[PDB]
Design a protein around this ligand. Sequence first.
Ligand SMILES: O=C1[C@H](Cc2cnc[nH]2)N2C(=O)CCN(C(=O)NCc3ccccc3)[C@H]2CN1Cc1cccc2ccccc12
Ligand SMILES: O=C1[C@H](Cc2cnc[nH]2)N2C(=O)CCN(C(=O)NCc3ccccc3)[C@H]2CN1Cc1cccc2ccccc12
Ligand SMILES: O=C1[C@H](Cc2cnc[nH]2)N2C(=O)CCN(C(=O)NCc3ccccc3)[C@H]2CN1Cc1cccc2ccccc12
Ligand SMILES: O=C1[C@H](Cc2cnc[nH]2)N2C(=O)CCN(C(=O)NCc3ccccc3)[C@H]2CN1Cc1cccc2ccccc12
Ligand SMILES: O=C1[C@H](Cc2cnc[nH]2)N2C(=O)CCN(C(=O)NCc3ccccc3)[C@H]2CN1Cc1cccc2ccccc12
Ligand SMILES: O=C1[C@H](Cc2cnc[nH]2)N2C(=O)CCN(C(=O)NCc3ccccc3)[C@H]2CN1Cc1cccc2ccccc12
Ligand SMILES: O=C1[C@H](Cc2cnc[nH]2)N2C(=O)CCN(C(=O)NCc3ccccc3)[C@H]2CN1Cc1cccc2ccccc12
Ligand SMILES: O=C1[C@H](Cc2cnc[nH]2)N2C(=O)CCN(C(=O)NCc3ccccc3)[C@H]2CN1Cc1cccc2ccccc12
Ligand SMILES: O=C1[C@H](Cc2cnc[nH]2)N2C(=O)CCN(C(=O)NCc3ccccc3)[C@H]2CN1Cc1cccc2ccccc12
Ligand SMILES: O=C1[C@H](Cc2cnc[nH]2)N2C(=O)CCN(C(=O)NCc3ccccc3)[C@H]2CN1Cc1cccc2ccccc12
Ligand SMILES: [Mg+2]
Ligand SMILES: [Mg+2]
Ligand SMILES: [Mg+2]
Ligand SMILES: [Mg+2]
Ligand SMILES: [Mg+2]
Ligand SMILES: [Mg+2]
Ligand SMILES: [Mg+2]
Ligand SMILES: [Mg+2]
Ligand SMILES: [Mg+2]
Lengths: 179, 182, 181, 187, 182, 186, 180, 180, 183
Amino acid sequence: IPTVYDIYSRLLKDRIIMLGSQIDDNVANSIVSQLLFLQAQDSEKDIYLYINSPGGSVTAGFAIYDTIQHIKPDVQTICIGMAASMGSFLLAAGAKGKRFALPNAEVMIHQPLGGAQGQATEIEIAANHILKTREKLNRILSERTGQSIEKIQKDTDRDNFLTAEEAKEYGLIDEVMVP
Amino acid sequence: IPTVIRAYDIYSRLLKDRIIMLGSQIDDNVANSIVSQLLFLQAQDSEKDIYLYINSPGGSVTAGFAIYDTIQHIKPDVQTICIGMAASMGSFLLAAGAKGKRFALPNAEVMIHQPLGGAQGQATEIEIAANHILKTREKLNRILSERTGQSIEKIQKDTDRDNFLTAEEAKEYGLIDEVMVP
Amino acid sequence: IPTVIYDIYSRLLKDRIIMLGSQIDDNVANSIVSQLLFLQAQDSEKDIYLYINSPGGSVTAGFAIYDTIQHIKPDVQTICIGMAASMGSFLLAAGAKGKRFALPNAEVMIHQPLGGAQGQATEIEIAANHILKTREKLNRILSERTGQSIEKIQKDTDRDNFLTAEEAKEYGLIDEVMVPE
Amino acid sequence: IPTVIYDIYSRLLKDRIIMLGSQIDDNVANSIVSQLLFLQAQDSEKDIYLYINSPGGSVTAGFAIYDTIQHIKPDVQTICIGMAASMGSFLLAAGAKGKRFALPNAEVMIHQPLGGAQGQATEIEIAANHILKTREKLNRILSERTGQSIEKIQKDTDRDNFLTAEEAKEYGLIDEVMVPEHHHHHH
Amino acid sequence: IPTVIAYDIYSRLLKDRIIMLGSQIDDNVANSIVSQLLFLQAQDSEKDIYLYINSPGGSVTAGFAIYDTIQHIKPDVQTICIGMAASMGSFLLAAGAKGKRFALPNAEVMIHQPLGGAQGQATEIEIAANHILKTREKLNRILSERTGQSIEKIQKDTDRDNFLTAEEAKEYGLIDEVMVPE
Amino acid sequence: LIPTVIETRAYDIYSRLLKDRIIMLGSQIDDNVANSIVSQLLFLQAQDSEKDIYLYINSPGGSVTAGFAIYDTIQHIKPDVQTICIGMAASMGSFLLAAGAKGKRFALPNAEVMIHQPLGGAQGQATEIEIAANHILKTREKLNRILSERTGQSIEKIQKDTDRDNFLTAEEAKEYGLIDEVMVPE
Amino acid sequence: IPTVIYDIYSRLLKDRIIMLGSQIDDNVANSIVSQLLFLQAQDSEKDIYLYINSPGGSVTAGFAIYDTIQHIKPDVQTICIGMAASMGSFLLAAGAKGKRFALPNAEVMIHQPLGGAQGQATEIEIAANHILKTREKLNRILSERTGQSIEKIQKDTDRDNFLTAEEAKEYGLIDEVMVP
Amino acid sequence: IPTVIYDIYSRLLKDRIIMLGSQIDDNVANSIVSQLLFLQAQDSEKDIYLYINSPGGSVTAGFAIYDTIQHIKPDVQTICIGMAASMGSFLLAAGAKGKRFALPNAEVMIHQPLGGAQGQATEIEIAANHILKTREKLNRILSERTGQSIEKIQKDTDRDNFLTAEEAKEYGLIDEVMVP
Amino acid sequence: LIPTVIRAYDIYSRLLKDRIIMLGSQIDDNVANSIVSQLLFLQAQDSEKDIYLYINSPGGSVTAGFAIYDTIQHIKPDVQTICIGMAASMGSFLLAAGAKGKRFALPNAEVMIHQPLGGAQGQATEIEIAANHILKTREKLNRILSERTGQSIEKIQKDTDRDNFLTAEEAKEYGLIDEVMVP
Ligand SMILES: O=C1[C@H](Cc2cnc[nH]2)N2C(=O)CCN(C(=O)NCc3ccccc3)[C@H]2CN1Cc1cccc2ccccc12
Ligand SMILES: O=C1[C@H](Cc2cnc[nH]2)N2C(=O)CCN(C(=O)NCc3ccccc3)[C@H]2CN1Cc1cccc2ccccc12
Ligand SMILES: O=C1[C@H](Cc2cnc[nH]2)N2C(=O)CCN(C(=O)NCc3ccccc3)[C@H]2CN1Cc1cccc2ccccc12
Ligand SMILES: O=C1[C@H](Cc2cnc[nH]2)N2C(=O)CCN(C(=O)NCc3ccccc3)[C@H]2CN1Cc1cccc2ccccc12
Ligand SMILES: O=C1[C@H](Cc2cnc[nH]2)N2C(=O)CCN(C(=O)NCc3ccccc3)[C@H]2CN1Cc1cccc2ccccc12
Ligand SMILES: O=C1[C@H](Cc2cnc[nH]2)N2C(=O)CCN(C(=O)NCc3ccccc3)[C@H]2CN1Cc1cccc2ccccc12
Ligand SMILES: O=C1[C@H](Cc2cnc[nH]2)N2C(=O)CCN(C(=O)NCc3ccccc3)[C@H]2CN1Cc1cccc2ccccc12
Ligand SMILES: O=C1[C@H](Cc2cnc[nH]2)N2C(=O)CCN(C(=O)NCc3ccccc3)[C@H]2CN1Cc1cccc2ccccc12
Ligand SMILES: O=C1[C@H](Cc2cnc[nH]2)N2C(=O)CCN(C(=O)NCc3ccccc3)[C@H]2CN1Cc1cccc2ccccc12
Ligand SMILES: O=C1[C@H](Cc2cnc[nH]2)N2C(=O)CCN(C(=O)NCc3ccccc3)[C@H]2CN1Cc1cccc2ccccc12
Ligand SMILES: [Mg+2]
Ligand SMILES: [Mg+2]
Ligand SMILES: [Mg+2]
Ligand SMILES: [Mg+2]
Ligand SMILES: [Mg+2]
Ligand SMILES: [Mg+2]
Ligand SMILES: [Mg+2]
Ligand SMILES: [Mg+2]
Ligand SMILES: [Mg+2]
């Protein structure tokens, strides 16, 4: 982590947040904290969320998602390298018209992953829970992309890799960012 | 394992007298052995009673149903006798014995509960696994109802959590017919 | 991790925001208790804001936080973001009356305490009596805090019970779903 | 394994009964192939009985059994007891026409083949092509054996598909569900 | 394991109606001993059986499998403690035919309350606690019947590890006689 | 994990509390923890020999000797040491709770206090086992005598009540004499 | 890491030098992307120097760096020192035209992408198709950057292909061997 | 184990020779107890010969063997070959009076019992009392078998006490050193 | 997590400013090196003022302990020793090494003395050398302990054959300390 401020701290000064890892609670807590801080500094100026992430925890993803929608500033999203799973969800959650990917960036969508062990009743509860979570994700993706819930369901049944151009056509981003 | 003398290990000697020992966790190996023994004993004599000793914590449901189905299939009555413990699929098999010939010894423990399992992967895979174990439970409960004379509704309630029964309670419940007195 | 002009968490603490963003253990509880006591000393009148994104954890560590909240003079707002499960949802419900919040897609889960015991029968008995008393304590406070009967709380926490933000509001675990500003 | 004055499995083999009661690997396949060939040599006309309680296993091992069954003259009856999954359900369906059975509470599961591949892109490609060809081969034979279309088999095996004995019969994986008087010779 | 002519040494002792419980009690051991007891009854319903006990104890349900089989069969089962009988081992020592429970002079007898475990939800812990407490009550009641001591005294005396000499075990009522040299 | 505070100097939160004479015993008691707490007690006495010190206890207990390092330092120094149980005080933790200045031992309402007999181990020769047994028995006699003095309960009662794990509510800890007061909200 | 009064790496960044001296993963990509952004913001006209001593690593992480290089205004010079293998050599070739360098004894290796897949046939199919497409993408860009045909790139990357600095130049992966 | 036309050990048992050639655990004790009772049943008058090459082991398992020796009618000769340590040397001393032997270079070691305890103070107390009572029992019987005082045995077993065969004879652990 | 006092010191450094050294761990070479360095520094600051060595230690390395012992004896200032919690083995040896009249324990502190521990593997000759070494070391420890306590070497040898736990009061009567420090 080079110094100038460490490099990430320096970027944050210019309202740039870097989501560059698996999404877990720690990452979500930091990005939530950064979003709230930037709102407090200036409630009008755009924020820039860089996304290079293979995804991760859905609830941690939703911590970031809800904070983005809560605050006043537009949050631009820029996919660089890869946005997969909850990462592609957050990519699609950026301000309308301000969701971007660079030309060689990859976007992947798939259904949520999980686990359950124990009694039949416990398995049932866990199964109902991840199914409801999927419905929730699909509903929001539908609203964000313009695709039907039915299409999202079908298209996320297995790993679905998209180019930046394909992500744009899908409605996950608004624009491929040109040199 | 002791030998008796015609030289038999003790278990083989009991089998000569139509006694089968289910004395471990139920897995596919155990089921294959017990199924083989049942089919052998039917061939040896299609009419004479078979005696199935049960000291088991249960195990695989499918392995258990291998034994269950073979018992119901063959012509001989299969007596069941709980000694020590019959839990889960073990208690299911105890209840599967010929009507009137299901026993426990006085200090034997019988435990009933819902089936256990696991699933990891995609939501759709979790769904399939969940639906499978729920159907499995419905299947078990339906047969338990038929074998005990209890309603399915009561079986469901009574198996929600671990439910330990004395021999005498197992009799009242309809899991066995009699407590075998000295 | 990032720094401003303060690490980001310390910067939020300057504005009376405490982040409960992990499993609750004694270390987390000690930290949050300390922050709560400091904030009271700095300003006994201004509200405090407790962010909760937690799968829960130690009950006694949870009660450390709970008792400090109730002890101090300032109102402690609770805001569920991401997930509040188990002792996490308990603390969510323990916020100042009228100032318990969840964001729209936040998840709230309630269930019964988990534990373990091994040894002699008498030791198992002691352990069982303990966790049962702990559950009664938890359920009574939840009853008081939500307006639900103890009997309903008992039934509703028998197994894992997942609630949406709106359901958590209807239940009385929170007062309001926080809508976009 | 108890003894009868023969270990129990050997005693059953005497009556032309083969027990497939485990995961299918090369050892299991070598054993069953040898038993089939032996039984044919003893008597080329009498039926053989293949018991199946198996979660499946190796596809190549399974095809060793499959091909030996179809090679020998005797009919090989199949009976599912407990569970027949994956390659196990394939072998269940490979029994002599009219002589494939399941007991009432037996479980039958069908799904697509599982595998792995690591290394260079071209190596991954080769592995992918190989398992995809293997699936086509399995599906074609299942189609012939069940009377279901390849298209239906493909759709039905995309994920784990659990069938009851009765469902397996209507699917054509088996021919019949084996269903179960007073006397005074009980003792 | 040496051979005699062809018997392994233990099988030779079984020929003379001697069963060796010389290990921790688990389901496998219980199944073996049960099988031996039933075989010996079938061989001769009237001649005494000798159960050698050198055991630190083990599974209570496994122990009860042995216990109930002893009480069920017609022949008297003598018990002889050699080395150590602890826990379920001492329970089975006490379960021998009245007047035919023995220990050799330097044999050790230890009684204590049952051990176990529980994890999971409070309700699950409660179920496990009620179960082991009921098991202890069952053990204590039978020990009371077998020793002539009150249930309350058994409870106190098994609260922690309680080591007895052979003579002390006789005075307690766990055995009838200390077997002195020939 | 540990946030910083800045006033008109920069402090980690724990250092800031120490500035106001608050010491945190918030972990298992071992030699390192005891060393830190002893050092803090000495320092605070030196800073002011008359002003109260506040010892927060959220601890499952731990080393008896390490506990006695803290105990003896509390008794040695001139300032009253208030004890405040928050979360849990168990074993040596509850011993130190009971060790606070008379009238200034507290617990918050849902704090858990647990008392039991000391734990230990010994392996090797019979005579080595004997030495270890005599040691832990003497140690228990020492603990119980002090507990008796601190609570007003008889040694006989303490012996009985610590035979196995004994979970007390804050209110029960007060009636037992382990604390003086259940701390009500400010 | 020595200090200058800056740690050494921070000191080099002050003079618009970025050090890629490890395996390429997401964390490394994130750092280099950030440095590239920062240096653009400091001065959009002055050249940036990217040192490459890397065995390669994540293709997606490498494309984060690749795309950021092509996005920003400043020319990014690339200098291979020690080794540039796999995605490392890809990024070496991605430097500003006329400003891709290697020192005389630096090693350059090109090969096809590596990966893995396990599970159902259809999952293996998806993984296979993905890495094959990734290889097409890599090869197409290499073709554009080197001036070699896609067909030649495919052949030459079928197995590990070690090049000297001089060989890398005549291949078109670099423009010049930096001579003492 | 070679075969004779019997495994070698079974052949020796035919001539009333029992091999205690390992650590003493419950399995070993059960086997030896069984052999002793069998040999008594075969002939209640003829001597038995117990070979001892053992580092000792479980005290209770040792007492299983000990009590069986004293119980049966036949004299049980003991012959230490190689090493008899701890419970091994206790059993050596337990042979029929006048018929306890060691070969010249055999090693005899006596020491106090080993054990362990963990948990609550009162549990440690119970375990301590137990092992102390066991040592009193061992020492009382050793005293009876050797003619040495309980006080002397206590002192001599405080730590590992290695004896030659000749020293074992003067100690009273054996009667005779068996000469070629 | 060591707290800071503010001129910003961690708590241990703050105590060192008042000439208090804290030995609160197993004695190894690192611990000895630090304590030796502290003793030297304090002597350099002021060669006349007392130093205070707090001891809560289960002991450890004999040679490390002797690095501390020798440095205490070498420097001009009196080094007081105060046993808090536990002083075992080499820890109790260092407690006894304090300036005469200035060795203390708090009332519930525990002092344990025993013989040194060690190990040896290899050839008979190597075992012999190791044995002779540890036996010499014990003679050295016992002789110094005799000088420090006023007890005979013969008594020290007997009393250290096995773990010997002393109360603070007993440690005083034994001569390991001068005084039990009363509140
Ligand atoms: O789309 C934009 C635009 C594009 C722009 C215009 N002029 C320079 N860059 N933008 C702004 O309009 C203001 C903030 N900003 C700065 O660079 N600000 C300067 C700066 C200062 C200190 C450190 C870093 C950057 C950028 C951030 N992003 C999003 C962005 C985020 C993360 C990584 C990226 C990689 C490649 C392209 C975009 C990226
Ligand atoms: O409910 C509130 C309200 C909401 C508000 C009103 N005006 C701005 N925000 N609130 C206050 O009323 C004062 C303190 N504060 C600041 O933002 N203060 C400004 C600030 C300064 C410096 C750093 C960060 C924030 C917030 C904290 N929270 C709780 C809270 C915690 C953590 C993460 C959250 C994410 C989303 C919503 C809420 C969050
Ligand atoms: O379906 C059949 C038929 C019909 C039949 C007769 N009794 C039950 N089912 N069959 C024959 O017609 C000849 C061979 N045979 C014998 O039982 N032969 C007698 C015998 C002798 C010695 C040992 C075992 C069995 C059986 C074998 N099988 C297949 C089979 C295999 C394995 C386990 C099974 C469990 C349950 C039902 C069938 C099973
Ligand atoms: O009982 C008390 C009393 C109670 C009081 C009276 N007015 C405010 N609080 N007390 C003092 O009388 C002086 C020191 N102090 C401060 O708060 N001082 C102010 C301060 C300044 C800077 C940081 C923290 C605290 C408190 C500490 N404690 C003990 C204590 C310790 C740890 C955590 C606790 C959590 C809940 C209750 C008590 C706690
Ligand atoms: O190709 C042949 C030929 C031709 C043949 C095929 N079916 C019957 N005959 N052959 C002989 O001409 C003599 C030996 N033999 C017997 O079966 N002999 C009878 C016999 C007796 C006893 C035990 C086993 C087999 C066979 C062995 N093989 C090779 C072979 C090996 C292993 C498994 C096989 C499975 C399927 C086909 C071939 C197999
Ligand atoms: O309930 C019965 C009845 C009734 C009976 C007669 N004597 C004891 N019980 N029964 C028969 O009617 C014929 C077969 N049989 C023999 O003992 N047969 C004799 C024999 C011969 C050779 C070896 C063993 C047993 C018994 C088996 N069982 C079931 C049984 C199984 C396993 C362990 C048990 C332990 C305790 C009680 C029952 C047990
Ligand atoms: O015996 C003494 C005496 C006793 C005294 C006098 N006034 C207060 N205490 N003493 C001095 O005479 C000068 C140095 N000093 C300070 O405390 N100085 C003040 C101070 C300043 C800064 C930080 C801490 C303490 C103390 C150190 N020790 C030794 C000592 C060491 C370690 C831990 C101990 C725990 C309990 C008792 C003693 C301890
Ligand atoms: O002291 C004796 C004497 C000595 C004797 C006299 N003639 C031969 N040997 N003795 C008997 O008086 C009868 C039994 N016996 C046989 O050798 N019997 C013959 C035999 C037959 C088959 C296998 C082994 C031995 C021996 C056993 N022992 C004890 C003994 C035990 C174990 C190992 C020993 C090693 C060395 C010396 C003694 C040993
Ligand atoms: O108490 C008895 C009684 C009385 C008796 C006779 N001699 C010694 N004790 N008993 C019989 O009345 C018939 C069966 N039997 C034989 O020895 N039978 C002879 C025999 C033949 C073949 C092999 C072994 C033993 C003995 C078994 N036991 C129990 C017993 C079990 C195990 C190990 C023991 C060790 C020491 C004492 C007793 C032991
Ligand atoms: O032999 C010497 C001599 C003699 C001396 C020792 N004590 C007083 N005088 N010496 C000097 O003549 C100049 C440097 N110095 C200081 O102490 N200087 C003062 C000082 C200032 C600040 C910090 C530490 C020491 C010492 C260092 N050494 C070597 C030495 C090294 C390391 C640890 C030792 C431990 C014990 C003895 C010697 C040690
Ligand atoms: Mg916004
Ligand atoms: Mg039947
Ligand atoms: Mg409040
Ligand atoms: Mg055929
Ligand atoms: Mg009987
Ligand atoms: Mg005080
Ligand atoms: Mg550029
Ligand atoms: Mg004798
Ligand atoms: Mg000095």
